Structure formats: structure tokens, C-alpha cells
Structure 1
Amino acid sequence: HSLIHTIKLNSNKKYGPGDMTNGNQFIISKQEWATIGAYIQTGLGLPVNEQQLRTHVNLSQDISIPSDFSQLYDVYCSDKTSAEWWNKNLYPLIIKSANDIASYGFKVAGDPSIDGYFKKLQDELDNIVDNNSDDDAIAKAIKDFKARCGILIKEAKQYEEAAKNIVTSLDQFLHGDQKKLEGVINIQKRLKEVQTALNQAHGESSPAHKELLEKVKNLKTTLERTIKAEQDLEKKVEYSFLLGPLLGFVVYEILENTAVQHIKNQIDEIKKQLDSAQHDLDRDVKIIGMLNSINTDIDNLYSQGQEAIKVFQKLQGIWATIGAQIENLRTTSLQEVQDSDDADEIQIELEDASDAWLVVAQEARDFTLNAYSTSNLEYKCPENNFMIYWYNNSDWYNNSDW
């Protein structure tokens, strides 16, 4: 965006928001969290027993499922549990950190309906260097100045700690929490194991097995290329199961993309081919195709998890420095104003920092406004209704031709 370039350029301004960017993205990136969120949706819908699996990949009741397939269930459950944890414990924090940026920015610069805190600080400095002002009024202005800065320092520290807490939550998402949460790293390990096993046993049984499973892998590769290529999301984030269980959820908006429409047609073709195929081909390609895509997904969850850790360590440092600079403002700078009887330079710095804060506050608001909202295993992952809309409204599950 134009605004992202403005934010870097501004990132040098004292009392301002600093470099709240991440490459060509806002430091809280709409596109990043939208993409991640797609993988999580897929996770939230994973099946954990035979009947669920059949319903999910859309396999005829008349088809037998070999026993080694059962390994799927435990790891799918863990993956699902992970997704649910993320949905409850991680993603809402991201929304909150965006809100913290909007809140601070509108507080110091003022809400567009307005005086923000920086204008109030400026006027206080006016009173401190006014010669008409008697000594009592000076002393009072100084106390008010320090108090108001103290509130900004407290909030900045709160936001700093919130960013630290996001980093901690990410480390738990990836490495587990030493309790009932298995980490993405271990989930990835087991998913790769099961993938190897099932591929050896049921993924190379015939030429058509290899052909079709390779076709699905190619579609996932292209889909992923397209996803990583599209930088700018213009719509409120929603998700779609249009591509079905072979590929997983995608951000709804990306359905417009020509390449993705091509992929939808190739998927419709696969469905036609499988639904009337020899039973073992039908079964193996649905189940293992989906599993291969889940492995690609979990790889993406891992790497983008590590990336996000780096981003929120950066944000953490930004709030630390914001608080440090306001502490300097209320002590050393304020004393200099008193000694020099000159406040104009500080006042103009506060004006300029106000404008920079407006820029990042608008980006934070935009993020929030457009973000997505919404061995037994039968008790750890009970059946829920999560996929039912998708089973009732996605083409993959249309069986009129059966």
C-alpha cells in the first residue's frame, strides 16, 4: 500500500509508532492471518473415526476401509485440537493487538470526531512557558503533563506485554504446552510418519494411484503458489470449501483468481473420475490425497508460526521504545523546556508524531474491520457440526450422479 511506505518513512519520528510494518505489509498483516486462518479452518473440520472420514472425503458406504488407515485418527484429532486451541487462545490476541495500536493512536492523535493527548501535552507546555502564567499554574501544568504521560507509559507497557504474550502463545502452539496441547512440530512429525506408511501401503498400488495422487499434489502446489503470490486482500475475510477435502479451505476472495478457477475445474474432473472408479482407487486417492494436503498445510502452519514469532518480537520492541520515549519526554525533555523556556520544537515533534500515529491507527482499524470473526477419541474430539454447512453446500458432496 501507499500507507505502508508512509509508515516506514515515518518510522524515524520521535514519539511516533516506529516501523509498524512487515515487509510490504502492516505489522499486523491482513493477508498473513487470513491465509493461516484457512489452514486452521481445515484443521477444525478433521474427522477422527471411520464414519466421519467417509462422510468427509465423500466415500460410498459400500466401500471397505483397510485397518492401517486407522492411524489417521489419532493424529487428525491432535491436529484438530491444535486448531481449536489456536482459534481460542491465539487468534483473538492478534485482533486485540491490532486494537491496541488503533486505541493508542486515536488516543494520542485524537478521534477524527474531536483533542488527543498530544495536543493536550502541547497546550500544557504553552502554559509552562507562558510568562503571564503564575508559579502555581506552572507547577500544576508540570504535574498534569507528567500524569498524562504516565498513562501513556502504562498503556504502552501493557501493549508490550501483550505482544510478549503473543510470542509465548506462538511458542506453545509450535512446541506444545507440556500438558494437553501437542505442538505443531510433533503433529507435523506424526503426520509425516502416517503419510509415509499410508503412501507405501496404499499410494503406489497401481499406475492410476500414482497418477491421480500426483495430480492432486500438483494442484496443491499451484494453489499454494497462487496463495503466496496474492499480496493484497480487498474484502472482509471469509472462507470457502469450494475446492473440497482434497485441497482444504481457502480465503473466499482468492476464488476469483483465474488459476484458482482452473484448479476448481480440475477438482471437478477428479471427482467425476473417482466417483465411478474402481473402489480401492476411489478410496485411496480421496483419503491419501487429503492427507498429503494436510501435510502441506501443517508445514505452512509451522513456518508461518516461526515468522509470526519474529513479527511480534518486533512489535514488542516497538512498544518498549514508545514507552521509553514518553518517559524521556516527561523527565529530561520537560526539564529542558523549563530551563530553556522554549517548547516549540517539542510541540512540533508531538504534532508530527500525532500524524504518524493516525496512519498506523487507520491500518490497525482496517485489520480489525476486515478480520475473520465467527484411542477412543469420542470425548477428546466429539463430533460437532463444523463441516455440516460445507457438506450441504459444496460441489464435492453433490452425488446426483451416483
Structure 2
Amino acid sequence: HSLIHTIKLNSNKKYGPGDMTNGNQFIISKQEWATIGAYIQTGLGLPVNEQQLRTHVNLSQDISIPSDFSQLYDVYCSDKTSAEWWNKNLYPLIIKSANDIASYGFKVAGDPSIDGYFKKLQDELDNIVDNNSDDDAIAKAIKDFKARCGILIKEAKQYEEAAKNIVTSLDQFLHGDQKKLEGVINIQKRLKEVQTALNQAHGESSPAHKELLEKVKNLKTTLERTIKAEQDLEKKVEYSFLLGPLLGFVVYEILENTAVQHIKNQIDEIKKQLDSAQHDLDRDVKIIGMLNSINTDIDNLYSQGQEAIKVFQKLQGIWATIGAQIENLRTTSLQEVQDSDDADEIQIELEDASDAWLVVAQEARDFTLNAYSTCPENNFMIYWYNNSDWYNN
């Protein structure tokens, strides 16, 4: 809370980490990635054929499935693959960019009881402007200084390139990869089209259709508003399928909040109504309710993705500027120090910049520490099927 505000204050400081914040959030935001990841787990567990669909929504074998429902299957496989792709190629990059920030910050700022790289640069300046230093100590110091700065510059450039690479993966995620990868934009468009068709055809069949499907939609809107509202996560990220296929996975921590549990109980009530309902209503409400929630999800995947693109272009800009400032320090500034025989301003700047770096490095460490870690089908839901009240009778 305090930490975010401070980072903004420090953002201007020369030799500093710049503005590593997003809104009220650290630039790699724990809550954001945890939530989006929930939508991804849901995606990864989607069912691609009739039998899989029946098993997933827990629909009786004794119940017939109309033929037009079949269009869902094709779009679901893409959505599932999309989820898998995201899992292999995009999410691990975010962890990496966080780890890089922690590494740089701890290098320049120092150990909790230890000297950081900035402390070494400062002492080297002390030796360069000391009039007792002979030429040799100066030649050595200028050399040590330039080399170490060279290392920071090289790492910064690498991180600049990694953030660029994250932006590129997001563009492929949203727009497809010119390969076997279909863009989310197209998945959203396709999902919506199937939604309209199936809702006209099987949404409106009976008063109870309109009622119950609207009730789930109401629940989905309500759950999400709560999700975007619950800004702070204090625990390790896990996922939960307690709310079942009607709503999808949520971050486990969110279970703690009172409103959601009420939702879990209300969802159990809806479940009770459907399991003994007329078959036609029961099948329609399961499938279209779920499909509707998936559509809300994909809307969030697109929206967040465009945001994340803007964010990592920012982080890229941040690393570029850091490298340019150390390259400036190394050459022009260093020459100025030799000519002026004065290092005090640069030194004080390094003290202040060091302090800002611990702050951002600690945020990066906490993120990584609390981040979730670890089409044949369909193994993925099997454990989940085991664990939800939804699937017991």
C-alpha cells in the first residue's frame, strides 16, 4: 500500500527503477495475473466432444443432446489450445521478468546485513578523486567502474529485449501466430456467434429457461464485480473449481470472502433444481449457462491482454532508460568527475537510487514467490471432477 506510493515518488530518481507501477499495482501485478490465470485454468479444462461435455457438466447418460449444440465443440478446442499455448509460451515469461527485476535490484542495492554494486561504484569514486591516490589506483578504479557499469548495461539491454518479447507473445495471443494458433479476437467472435444462435434456439424455450439462465448470468456478473474489487491477495495463489462449470475456476483465496460462499451455496441450490428438472430445461441450462460464463471470460482475456500489452511496453521503456543512464554515468559523467575532482552529487544520487531499488526488488520477489507455479484429453479436469460438490450423487 505504502510501497506503491513510494515507488511513484522514487520514479523520477536518476539511476532509479523508474515508474514500476500499474495503477495501484506493482508493474507485475499479483492480483491481475492470478485472476487471468483463473480464466486460463477454466479454458484448459474445456470439453471437446459429446461424451466429454456430458461428463463435464454432469449430465445424465439418459438425456439426449440436440444436434446444433455440436458447434460449441469446435470453438472449444481452439479455446482450450489457446489456453495451453498461453500456459507454455506467455505465463512463464512474466515470472521471468519479475525475477530479472529482483536480480538487478538486489545486485545494485545490497544484502540485508552485508554491499551492493552501487556501494562499490561509490568507493571507486572516492579513490578517483582522492588526492592521495597515485595514478595507478585511478587507472584501476576507472577500469573497475567502467566494467561493472558495463555489466549492468548489458543486463538491462537483455531485460529490455525480454519485455519486448512479452509484448510480441501477447500480440500473437490476441491475434494468432500465423500458424496453428487462432487469435483470441477470433475465439471471442466465434464464441459470441455460437452464443447468440444457441441462445435464440435453446435459451428462450421456457419461462424457466429465461429465469435460470438469467440467474446464472446475474451470478457471473456479481462474482466478477467482486473479483475485480478484491484488490489485495495475501496468500499463495491456488485455484478452485468449487463454483463449478456454470461459473468456472476462481482464485482459492477469494473463497474466504463472504459473498462468494453465499454464491457457492446458491449454485448448489440451482444444481439441486436442475438435477431433478425436466430434461430439456436441465440440459439447456447447463450448456448455455456455462457457455455464457466462458463468453464473459473471453471478454476479460481480450481486455486484460490489451492492457498487459500497454504495461510491458512501459517496462521495456523503463529498462532502456536505465541502461542509457548507466552508459551516461560510465562515460560523460565519469569524465566530468575527473575534470571537476568532485563526485558528491553522483554519490548521493546513488544512495537514493539504491534505496528505490530495494523497494522494487522486494516487490518482484514477493510476486514470484506468490505466483501460481505448478487435443487428446481430457486428463486435466479429472482431479477437479473428483473435488467439486457438483459431481456427487
Note whether the superposition's TM-score is higher than 0.5: yes
Following superposition, the deviation at residue 113 of structure 1 comes to 4.8
Distance 2:260 2:323 in 1: 46
Question: Following the alignment from structure 1 to structure 2, what is the Cα–Cα distance between the partners of residues 190 and 44?
Answer: 18
Aligned-residue offset at 1:383: 1.1
Cα deviations by residue, 1:178-210 (Å, 9 ceiling, x for unpaired) = 101111100001101111111111111111111
CA apart distance, 1:132:
1.3
Answer whether contact 2:43 2:79 (CA < 8 A) is retained: yes
- 2: distance between equivalents of 1:328 and 1:114? 28
- Asked whether the 8 Å contact 2:237–2:253 carries over to 1, the reply is yes
Tell me, in whole angstroms, the C-alpha distance in 1 between the residues paired with 2:339 and 2:382: 71
Q: Distance in 2 between matches of 1:299 and 1:75?
A: 15
1:291, distance to aligned residue in structure 2 (A): 0.1
Give the TM-score normalised by the residue count of structure 1: 0.97
Q: CA deviation at 1:258?
A: 1.5
1:43-67: CA deviations, max 9, x gaps? Answer: 0000000000001011000000011
Residue deviations 1:84-131, cap 9 Å, x none?
Answer: 000110000000000000000001012325321101111111110111
Unpaired stretches in structure 1, ≥5 consecutive residues: 375-380
Structure 1's 182 and 113: CA in aligned 2 closer, same or farther, altered over 3 A? farther
Q: Which range is displaced more, 141-150 or 41-50?
A: 141-150
CA contact (8 A) 2:47 2:378 kept: no
1:331-372 deviation per Cα after TM superposition (whole angstroms, max 9, x unaligned) = 111111101111111111111111100000000000000000
Q: Which moved more, 1:169-178 or 1:194-203?
A: 194-203
1:325-340 paired onto structure 2 within 5 Å: 325-340=325-340
CA RMSD of aligned residues (A): 0.7
- Three-state SS of the structure 1 residue aligned to 2:324 is helix
CA positional deviation for 1:384: 3.2
Partners in 1 of 2:356 and 2:43 — Cα distance?
39
SS at match of 2:244: coil
Please name the residue that 1:239 is paired with.
239
Q: Distance in 1 between matches of 2:217 and 2:257?
A: 19
Structure 1: how far apart are the matches of 2:96 and 2:260? Answer: 32
For residues 43 and 28 of structure 1, the distance between their equivalents in structure 2, rounded to whole angstroms, comes to 22
Task: Give the CA deviation at 1:136.
Answer: 1.8
Measure, in 2, the Cα distance between the counterparts of 1:12 and 1:317. 14
Unaligned residue ranges in structure 2 (runs of 5+): none
Q: Is this contact kept in 1: 2:89–2:169, CA < 8 A?
A: yes
1:377 corresponds in structure 2 to none
Tell me the SS of whatever aligns to 2:102. Answer: helix
Equivalents in 2 of 1:315, 1:383: separation in Å?
37
2:377 alignment counterpart: 383
Provide the secondary structure at the position in 2 that maps to 1:60: coil
**Alpha-carbon offset, residue 36 of structure 1:** 0.2
Q: Out of 76-85 and 340-349, give the one that drifted further.
A: 340-349
Note if contact 2:78-2:187 (Cα within 8 Å) is conserved in structure 1: yes
Deviation at 1:288, TM superposition (A): 0.5
Identity of counterpart residues, as a percentage?
100
Q: Does 1:50 align with 2:50?
A: yes
Post-superposition Cα deviations, 1:16-45, rounded to whole Å, max 9, x if no partner, equal 101100010000000000010000000000
The residue aligned with 1:82 is 82
Provide the rounded CA distance (Å) in 2 between the counterparts of 1:64 and 1:280.
Answer: 9
- CA–CA separation in structure 1 for the residues paired with 2:133 and 2:312: 45
